[PDB]
Amino acid sequence: GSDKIIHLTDDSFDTDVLKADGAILVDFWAEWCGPCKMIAPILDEIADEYQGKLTVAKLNIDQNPGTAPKYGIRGTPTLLLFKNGEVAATKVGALSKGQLKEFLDANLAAA
């Protein structure tokens, strides 16, 4: 995976995400997950391409069972875009690089 991705834990979520200075896109994922597997390389490219405008983060739900229920996540992958501690947009399921780009470009700009 990209070395630019922040791997979050249950204990680090509040500090890493809600206290972040800028936008953080959070990937809720798991080992046995076709769709998680499919957006992974896509996310790597976004981390590279959106550096300075966004930080990509991962929450592994096998290793961190607590955070996902708090945020209404009912499946994986689910992407949550955070801004100054606020969930600002949500995307469930696999998507294309093109779809993820349009979602981010639309949502990063909205304040």
UniProtKB/Swiss-Prot annotation:
It comes from Escherichia coli (strain K12). The record marks G34, P35 as: Contributes to redox potential value. Belongs to the thioredoxin family. Monomer. Interacts with bacteriophage T3 DNA polymerase. The modification N6-acetyllysine is found at K70. Disulfide bonds join C33-C36. InterPro entries: Thioredoxin, Thioredoxin-like_sf, Thioredoxin_CS, Thioredoxin_domain. PANTHER family: GEO12009P1. The keyword Transmembrane helix does not apply. GO terms for cellular component: cytoplasm; cytosol. GO terms for biological process: cell redox homeostasis. The record marks D27 as: Deprotonates C-terminal active site Cys. Signal peptide: none annotated. Gene3D superfamilies: Glutaredoxin. GO terms for molecular function: DNA polymerase processivity factor activity; protein-disulfide reductase activity. The keyword Ubl conjugation does not apply. This is Thioredoxin 1. Residues 2-109 form the Thioredoxin domain. The gene is trxA.
